[PDB]
């Protein structure tokens, strides 16, 4: 069966970009 | 007509004050400025903001320049990128270090990043990580800048994460899997692995093989909240990307190495207050954890499967055999006195999805792990042939459905939430424990209401109100949740309702 998570914007939901921005001041 | 007043600065010079006609090409402005300071080759230069992240001005972003802004004349992004292509590869280690520092600064600017990327600049960085010597020991500062620049460049979305070599992957994973190195290197290494996992199923597979549960969990035990945040983020990423058929195994593996209590002791009860991005990761972890229940919640019992029918038989046996003429009377009514709506074929009641087999799992947990509570609830209601018995089977199925609704089993994680219930971090089987607490609550409320079968939905509504008014107090433990529920008896719910009316 397919993953229920397959269709989402993982970086957006995870705040990945914001966390990098926080880290890189 | 369309003017912006700026000052343009250059080290060693006095600012030029310009009224920039926004119709004039930037090249014309820059030639004017260079001529003003007797600088040849204006095509070698560009403008950038003096303040903030000091971004390069393009024919686009010039529109955002506010009156009174201070700009700086600077080396053009193209020339800067070419210079750094040379210098980041210098055999002079101070030249290389200085270049990497400048690259880490400039790589956040997409105008610069595109120039550098178009010369395979990212490969300069990955080749260095793949094959550079003494990086952790002698050149850890250079390596941190290298990883900063790498992540900044990749964050512009110009190139695919699948460009990375297995060698580069293995090296980054090596920095995470090692008896902890430099904090700056570990932070960036975790960050790179998270981004790789989120952006590619292929990279997920390779990374899952290179890092152990134990190694990841150990990073939660450092006092640095950003390390902890990226560690949980990487864990969350692995769960998000794991195939549906592997996610449960992964949860069991993390649980066996005490992920939950380590988060409880080192994050939730840690010295440093939880800031927003860690809270968000705890929210995502809880969402993913509750979603492990979703398959069973939507699995119907197969009423023709004798093994599954035998589970219900076992359930009934545990209770009824704890009670002799009385016991016989109970069994003559099949499953009626265990409270199932379908007296003769209770398996049919588990074809309702939600909660399907999850309800059965909860009942079996209560009966095996909390046998005394199970027996008490069933036997107080199994000889009751006044209309006042609380029907266990029906109640347990509806309660399981209610808990799934309250806790949002099946909901996807999203960007806007940072909420979690801390008490679920305090028990390995918190969902099942919560079920047991709530079925005791349901029976207490039922009795407080002198309820009959016709009252079933009204009692469930009171119980829903009790549970959902208790959770916002953020009980720290299941015991605290129980104490809170005691303060919300039926009579108190009545009082609260009256106060709304």
Numbering used by the authors:
A (entry chain C): 1471 to 1495
B (entry chain A): 5 to 327, 338 to 515
Question: What does the paper behind this entry write?
Answer:
In the present study, we perform a detailed biochemical characterization of the BAI1/ELMO2 interaction, and find that an evolutionarily conserved fragment located in the intracellular region of BAI1 specifically binds to the RBD-ARR-ELMO (RAE) tandem of ELMO2. To elucidate the assembly of BAI1/ELMO2 complex, we solve the crystal structures of the RAE tandem of ELMO2 and its complex with BAI1 at 2.5-Å and 1.7-Å resolutions, respectively. The RBD, ARR and ELMO domains of ELMO2 bind tightly and form a structural and functional supramodule, creating a highly conserved elongated concave groove capable of specifically binding to the BAI1 fragment. Each member consists of the Ras-binding domain (RBD), the armadillo repeats domain (ARR), the engulfment and motility (ELMO) domain, the pleckstrin homology (PH) domain and the C-terminal proline rich region (PRR).
To delineate how then the BAI1-EBD is recognized by this ELMO2-RAE supramodule, we solved the crystal structure of ELMO2-RAE in complex with a synthetic BAI1-EBD peptide at 1.7-Å resolution using the molecular replacement method. Each asymmetric unit contains one BAI1/ELMO2 complex with 1:1 stoichiometry, consistent with our biochemical data. There is no significant conformational change in the RAE tandem of ELMO2 upon binding to BAI1-EBD. Except the N-terminal 4 residues and the C-terminal 7 residues, the electron densities of the rest of the BAI1-EBD (i.e., aa 1471-1495) are clearly defined in the complex. The BAI1-EBD peptide, composed of two short α-helices, occupies the elongated concave groove formed by the ARR and ELMO domains. The complex assembly is mainly mediated by two parts of interactions: (1) the C-terminus of BAI1-EBD forms extensive polar interactions with ELMO2-RAE. For example, R1489BAI1 forms a salt bridge with E198ELMO2; H1485BAI1 forms hydrogen bonds with E281ELMO2 and E429ELMO2, and the sidechain of H284ELMO2 forms hydrogen bonds with the mainchain of I1483BAI1 and sidechain of N432ELMO2; (2) the N-terminus of BAI1-EBD mainly forms hydrophobic interactions with ELMO2-RAE. The hydrophobic core is formed by Tyr1475, Leu1478, Phe1480, Ile1483, Met1484 from BAI1-EBD and Leu202, Leu244, Val288, Leu292, Pro427 from ELMO2-RAE. Particularly, S1473BAI1, R1474BAI1, E248ELMO2, R251ELMO2, E298ELMO2 form a hydrogen bond network. Notably, the binding site of BAI1 on ELMO2 is far away from the RhoG-binding site, suggesting that RhoG and BAI1 would not compete with each other when binding to ELMO2-RAE.
